[PDB]
Design a binder for this molecule. Structure first.
Ligand code: CL
Ligand code: CL
Ligand code: ZN
Ligand code: ZN
Ligand code: ZN
Ligand code: ZN
Ligand code: ZN
Ligand code: ZN
Ligand code: ZN
Ligand code: ZN
Ligand code: ZN
Ligand code: ZN
Ligand code: ZN
Ligand code: ZN
Lengths: 89, 90
């Protein structure tokens, strides 16, 4: 139901406004090099984990802004279903 | 069990490894709920929730990769190859 909230036509348009507002392979190659090795190089692993911190930040920002904007187009009835869904995931 | 012709005892060692680094309750994503379910979006608080989440992401990626590296190193040369091939497709 994470998307089943009885959206009105206006809300469906609004979500599309919104996602126009907010619209990892070299990384997995680097994880592979750390996994496929006869030892575990913790220092190298930490540097790999960190390397795309900024792209991850911008990505999570966009998604949280998106979800907050969608939340705010919802009626009270719909907000409670969204929140109850949030609690169970 | 991914068609690697894992032997029976490779199957068991893998279980000891999985539960071994399982000796790691994670965080409180209640914070993130409160950012999303707010009249206004607070970018600075959202950035702080993200940076806090980086710390648990680091801990869980370190665990996952170390666990996978241990598994890799109980494999034969030919199994390593099919493990590497299978890694490419996921
Ligand atoms: Cl890869
Ligand atoms: Cl929550
Ligand atoms: Zn209609
Ligand atoms: Zn590329
Ligand atoms: Zn690879
Ligand atoms: Zn590589
Ligand atoms: Zn070596
Ligand atoms: Zn460290
Ligand atoms: Zn950093
Ligand atoms: Zn930054
Ligand atoms: Zn914005
Ligand atoms: Zn809260
Ligand atoms: Zn603030
Ligand atoms: Zn260790």
């Amino acid at each position: 139901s994470f998307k089943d909230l009885n959206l009105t036509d206006a809300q469906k348009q609004q979500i599309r406004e919104i996602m126009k507002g907010q619209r990892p392979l070299e990384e997995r190659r680097a994880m592979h090099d750390i996994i496929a090795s006869d030892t575990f190089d913790k220092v190298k692993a930490e540097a790999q984990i960190a390397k795309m911190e900024e792209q991850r930040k911008a990505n999570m920002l966009a998604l949280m802004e998106t979800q907050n904007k969608i939340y705010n187009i919802l009626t009270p009835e719909q907000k409670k279903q969204f929140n109850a869904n949030f609690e169970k995931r």
